[PDB]
């Protein structure tokens, strides 16, 4: 869950154009039910897909089990038909909840 601290001038708007989200859809994450913004207060963010550049010794498997999904997730997101992996590829990761 990826979440932010409002700084001194942000707006619902503000923080939205950034992280490429609408104002809408991050009060309705929050259950906010106003524009005001409190300097110091915490917003959860849309979820945005994470990434993995393979590594040396890296296995769909253990990738897997570091991001709390599995290896049949893993290749599904990715397209993969075979387990195999190659340092430097870039893989895209499920949630947490093999999502």
Do not use: C, W
């Amino acid at each position: 869950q990826a979440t932010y601290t409002v700084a001194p001038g942000d707006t619902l708007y503000s923080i939205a154009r950034r992280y490429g989200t609408t104002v809408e859809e991050l009060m309705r994450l929050n259950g906010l039910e106003s524009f005001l913004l409190q300097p110091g207060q915490v917003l959860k963010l849309p979820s945005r897909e994470r990434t993995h550049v393979v590594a040396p010794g890296d296995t769909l498997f253990s990738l897997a089990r570091r991001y709390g999904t599995t290896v049949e997730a893993l290749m599904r997101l990715n397209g993969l038909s075979s387990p195999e992996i190659k340092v430097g590829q870039v893989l895209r990761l499920p949630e947490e909840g093999e999502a």
